[PDB]
A = this chain, B = another copy of it.
């Protein structure tokens, strides 16, 4: 009787699960919203510095209208290699945001110290790897909360809390090529093996090297650590990067997981649209919404506020034809990265983006526990596409206007701002705006004039 080879089965549910972390794929939690859970772990935020500049260059004539194709290829070649190290070292990639990603090693509190060594080692191999591209890495460890918010057809998750704030702060300090530990990570780690230098005006520290003791064998130490890793591929499946590669059809699980993934991606998953059409350099409008709270580490406070704000944001995006591309905590606040055009006639798309932004601003300002709303609106050519590895990848955007909109909303809090492309392009009369003082902004060479969107009445 033959025992013929069974082919890898690339079911829709498996393709869907490439877009999500094990935290959701295997999570099985309540479908109620907001939902909150609490755990501990180590976080790694990995940033490839330089793709934003490359993005601009790939619009140039030398790329012969294949810029988006070339950009995504060279980006995924590099990011793929990082994704593989993360996964082989046992991490769960939570999200991609442009040319960066955030990973988690969720473990019981006693195991944090050892896993910190695993993550440090991972970081240093990543730092080793391989355009003018640098990698910066921030690490944090401690208490983490997860929030899941949404409606009956869409779900979104976030991690929240001091370790999440720390991992942002750490990454923002890294010089090109640093690996930075949050103060708490440094406090919890195996200091006898981890050799650091100090950081100016900071309690965070920079890793110089690992100095294992005489009897230390990394392979055996890792093996012990894998006792605590619920989904580490093993035994018959030890040749796989993710357990989620073995998921089987299950209509209930697929119904739940598809709610996290945008419809145009589901269309490609279902082989109803060609792959190529989602990788593009297209003119869009970014609307970057920031919500600040009295206490942004307290899920049970902020969770309902985020859900409330989400319910309105989504109804208003539907009307003005925008989408939520990504949601994450900044150091300061919960941020919604929304996109218009991914389109109407262009004075109209611009105008809608602005009216949508004002409406979200007015509504969210009144939501209980939201301290401040800030929104930045910027327009230009940005890269849109699927970034990552075959087994773990996400739709995302990269571009100078994405970063500019983020910087605006942070440096001009409490108001709606827009750049001159948006100002000049909109259908709206000039006295709906106020020309603003030029601020010097981290990461930004020249914004051109910035404006506040004051709105219809005085």
CB of A129 within 8 A of chain B?
A: no
B-side contacts of A1, CB under 8 Å: 88-89, 219, 222-223
A48 to B238, CA, bound (A): 34
Question: Residue-by-residue, is A256-281 near B (CB-CB < 8 Å gives 1, otherwise 0)?
Answer: 00110000001100111111110100
> Once the chains bind, are A64 and B153 in contact (CB under 8 Å)?
yes
- Which of B6, B239, B248, B273 contacts A2 (CB under 8 A)? B239
CB of A429 within 8 A of chain B?
A: no
CB of A63 within 8 A of chain B?
A: yes
> Once the chains bind, are A233 and B2 in contact (CB under 8 Å)?
yes
> Once the chains bind, are B266 and A275 in contact (CB under 8 Å)?
no
B-side contacts of A259, CB under 8 Å: 64
A440 to chain B, nearest CB (A): 32
Q: A69: nearest residue on chain B (CB-CB)?
A: B270
> Once the chains bind, are A239 and B4 in contact (CB under 8 Å)?
yes
Question: Interface extent on A, as a size class?
Answer: 35 or more
> Once the chains bind, are A272 and B276 in contact (CB under 8 Å)?
yes
A62 to B255, CA, bound (A): 8
CB of A128 within 8 A of chain B?
A: no
A115 to chain B, nearest CB (A): 14
B-side contacts of A73, CB under 8 Å: 11-13, 249, 251, 254
CB of A442 within 8 A of chain B?
A: no
CB of A228 within 8 A of chain B?
A: no
Chain A contact residues: over half helix, strand or loop, or mixed?
Answer: loop
B-side contacts of A66, CB under 8 Å: 258, 266, 270
**In the complex where A64-B255, A66-B270, A266-B66 touch, is A4 in contact with B277 (Cβ < 8 A)?**
no
B-side contacts of A274, CB under 8 Å: 271-274
B-side contacts of A254, CB under 8 Å: 70, 73
CB of A194 within 8 A of chain B?
A: no
A223 to B1, CA, bound (A): 7
This chain's copy number in the assembly: 3
CB of A74 within 8 A of chain B?
A: yes
A273 to B275, CA, bound (A): 9
Question: Residue-by-residue, is A221-248 near B (CB-CB < 8 Å gives 1, otherwise 0)?
Answer: 0110000000011000011110000001
A58-103 interface with B by 8 A CB criterion = 58, 62-64, 66, 69-70, 73-74, 77, 84, 88-89
**In the complex where A239-B5, A276-B270 touch, is A11 in contact with B64 (Cβ < 8 A)?**
no
A4 to chain B, nearest CB (A): 5
B-side contacts of A7, CB under 8 Å: 390
Q: A70: nearest residue on chain B (CB-CB)?
A: B251
B-side contacts of A3, CB under 8 Å: 88
> Once the chains bind, are B69 and A248 in contact (CB under 8 Å)?
no
Question: Residue-by-residue, is A1-36 near B (CB-CB < 8 Å gives 1, otherwise 0)?
Answer: 111111100011100000000000000000000000
A336 to chain B, nearest CB (A): 22
B-side contacts of A6, CB under 8 Å: 84
Most chain B CB inside 10 Å of its own CB: which residue of A11, A73, A240, A266 = A73
A58 to B266, CA, bound (A): 17
A257 to chain B, nearest CB (A): 11
A238 to B1, CA, bound (A): 9
Q: A65: nearest residue on chain B (CB-CB)?
A: B263
A196-225 interface with B by 8 A CB criterion = 219, 222-223
B-side contacts of A251, CB under 8 Å: 58, 63, 70, 73-74, 131
Q: A64: nearest residue on chain B (CB-CB)?
A: B153
B-side contacts of A239, CB under 8 Å: 2, 4-5
A279 to B241, CA, bound (A): 30
B-side contacts of A74, CB under 8 Å: 249-251
A355 to chain B, nearest CB (A): 29
> Once the chains bind, are A238 and B272 in contact (CB under 8 Å)?
no
> Once the chains bind, are A4 and B238 in contact (CB under 8 Å)?
yes
A261 to B258, CA, bound (A): 34
Q: List 10 A-B contacts (CB under 8 A).
A: A11-B77, A58-B251, A63-B251, A63-B255, A64-B255, A70-B254, A70-B255, A74-B249, A74-B250, A272-B276
Top 9 nearest A-B pairs (CB, nearest first) are A271-B276, A272-B276, A271-B275, A77-B249, A270-B276, A74-B249, A73-B249, A69-B270, A4-B239
